[PDB]
Structure formats: C-alpha cells, structure tokens
C-alpha cells in the first residue's frame, strides 16, 4: 500500500457509487483519523491492508499500523490552516484563528468553518506545517453552523 506521508481521503463502496466518509493523515507509516469515520474497521491501501492499532471513542481518534505519532499543539495565539479535503473537491487550505472550547477538564482550540461531515479527519496545521489535530468533532451553535474541536492525540 501507499505509505507516503500526506493527507488521504477515506472512501467506501458499501453505498451508492464511491462515497467519501472522511479524511486522514499518514505520518511515519501510521494512518491517523477520527473514530467516527472508520468505527475501528480495517482499511485498504491498493492491495495492502491497514489494521487498527490504537483507538478511543471518547477522544474520537484511531491509528493504523502503529501508535499515534502527532504531538504538535496549538500555541493558543497564532492563526492555523484547516487542510480541508471535501468530497469530490481538491485539498484546500483555509486559514483561521481558532476559538476555545471551555470544559471542566481544560480548554481546547476550536475552528468555526462549515464543511460536509465527509471532511471529518482533515488536519489542522501550525505555521511549520505540523499537524496540531483533526477537524470533525465539535458542536452545532445557535446559528445552525458547526464548530470543531482541534482534536489531538497523545504520543508515548
């Protein structure tokens, strides 16, 4: 299978035509996505098989072929880019200043950009192109719009 670092679409044929269910990041031979995209299922990369390695429904994260590799953090100050990979449409960088999810367990970056649910797992980047977390788990607001956490895993 293709193991080149970068961003990938996650597709299924179990529905009408070929449907994009989400997005992920290949880094150091590990594929990183959100749990709600795959539900922990194995993946194909050509004729190669990717098996889940680590997963947590509460973090809504999952890794294939090895442990979670991405440990960059939003600095709490600078603008970021959502590298959106919408269904049918080319990768596009969107630059934004994240808001803040306030929780009992601490504050998290949040990005307020509308994209379809099939965009879930697209990476959020810092100015050095490091992945500071993934887009696709968040909350619906008074407007009707969506606000995603900047979801980041832990590296060991």
């Amino acid at each position: 299978g293709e193991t080149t670092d970068g961003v990938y679409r996650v597709m299924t044929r179990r529905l009408l035509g070929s449907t994009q269910v989400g997005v992920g990041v290949m880094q150091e031979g590990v594929f990183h996505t959100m749990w709600h995209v795959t539900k922990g299922a194995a993946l194909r990369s050509g004729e190669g098989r990717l098996d889940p390695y680590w997963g947590d429904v509460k973090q809504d994260l999952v890794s294939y072929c090895g442990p979670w590799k991405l440990d960059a953090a939003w600095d709490g100050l600078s603008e970021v880019q959502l590298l959106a990979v919408p269904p049918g449409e080319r990768a596009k960088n969107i630059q934004t200043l994240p808001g803040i999810f306030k929780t009992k367990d601490g504050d998290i970056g949040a990005v307020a950009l509308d994209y379809p649910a099939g965009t879930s797992g697209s990476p959020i980047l810092d100015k050095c192109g490091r992945v500071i977390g993934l887009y696709g788990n968040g909350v619906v607001i008074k407007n009707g719009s969506y606000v995603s956490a900047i979801t980041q895993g832990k590296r060991e």
Binding site: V23, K58, A91
Partner: protein, 39 residues
C-alpha cells in the same frame, strides 16, 4: 469496505483564503465522545 487515496502534501500555504470567527464556547464531552453546549 473502506480504502484510502492520497489527496496532497501537508503544507502551510502562504496566501490561503482567510475566513471563520473565534468563538469562546462552554461545552461538555460525554462518554460517547459527543460534545454539547453547556448554558
């Protein structure tokens, strides 16, 4: 049965479309990993 396709390099691109606001929201995270607005 799910498969992946490459869609680009992961790169900061100078002069990308700048958009979106920066809202400060009170939220709760449940055991199913679903966020909700606390009010």
């Amino acid at each position: 049965d799910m498969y992946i396709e490459r869609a680009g390099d992961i790169t900061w691109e100078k002069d990308a479309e700048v958009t979106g606001n920066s809202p400060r929201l009170d939220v709760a995270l449940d055991e199913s990993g679903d966020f909700s607005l606390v009010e």
